Write an enzyme that holds these catalytic residues in place. Structure first.
Site, PDB file in Angstrom:
ATOM      1  CD  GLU A  11      -1.505   1.753 -13.528  1.00  0.00           C
ATOM      2  OE1 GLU A  11      -0.548   2.469 -13.492  1.00  0.00           O
ATOM      3  OE2 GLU A  11      -1.890   1.159 -12.497  1.00  0.00           O
ATOM      4  CG  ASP A  20       4.999   4.921  -9.192  1.00  0.00           C
ATOM      5  OD1 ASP A  20       5.610   5.706  -8.533  1.00  0.00           O
ATOM      6  OD2 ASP A  20       4.588   3.767  -8.733  1.00  0.00           O
TER       7      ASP A  20
END
Ligand SMILES: [Cl-]
Ligand SMILES: [Cl-]
Length: 162
Positions: A11, A20
């Site tokens: 991540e 994202d």
């Protein structure tokens, strides 16, 4: 290696609000804030999560804190899901991490599309599972990450992360 390092790798860490891969407002170590297209909405959710007026920026400590909580919740989601839990309990430690990774990324939701893969995992048919898991939007959208996770399930080692 462990779940935390694994996820930290997949991540990344960003201290300012960002979008994202799906375009959703996120911060920290993949902490999703909101699916709303509103930056203000996001900022509101961030302040609420942190407990202060952040103005869209957080510290490393703060990030790590959200992270810990997020892992915790993912596990807890797993243990509370009747379809998931049995699978999880049947697995070894490395593979458990692969599974937490996935829930962290997409939630409990979608567990139904993953029925077949589950079954395969429960039976320990690693290569077959690996193939089935790749037949997914998940894999098609985030192939590098998916490969790492799938490899983990396939091998039961951390090699993909080394
Ligand atoms: Cl929160
Ligand atoms: Cl990827």
């Amino acid at each position: 290696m462990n779940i935390f390092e694994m996820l930290r790798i997949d991540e990344g860490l960003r201290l300012k609000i960002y979008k994202d891969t799906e375009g959703y407002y996120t911060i920290g170590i993949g902490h999703l804030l909101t699916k709303s297209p509103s930056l203000n909405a996001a900022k509101s959710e961030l302040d609420k999560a942190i407990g202060r007026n952040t103005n869209g920026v957080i510290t490393k400590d703060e990030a790590e804190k959200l992270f810990n909580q997020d892992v915790d919740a993912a596990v807890r989601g797993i243990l509370r899901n009747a379809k998931l839990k049995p699978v999880y309990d049947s697995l070894d430690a490395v593979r458990r991490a692969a599974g937490i990774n996935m829930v962290f990324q997409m939630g409990e939701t979608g567990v139904a599309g993953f029925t077949n893969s589950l079954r395969m995992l429960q039976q320990k048919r690693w290569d077959e599972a690996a193939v089935n898991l790749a037949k997914s939007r998940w894999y098609n959208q985030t192939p590098n990450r998916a490969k790492r996770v799938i490899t983990t399930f396939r091998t039961g080692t951390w090699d993909a992360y080394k």
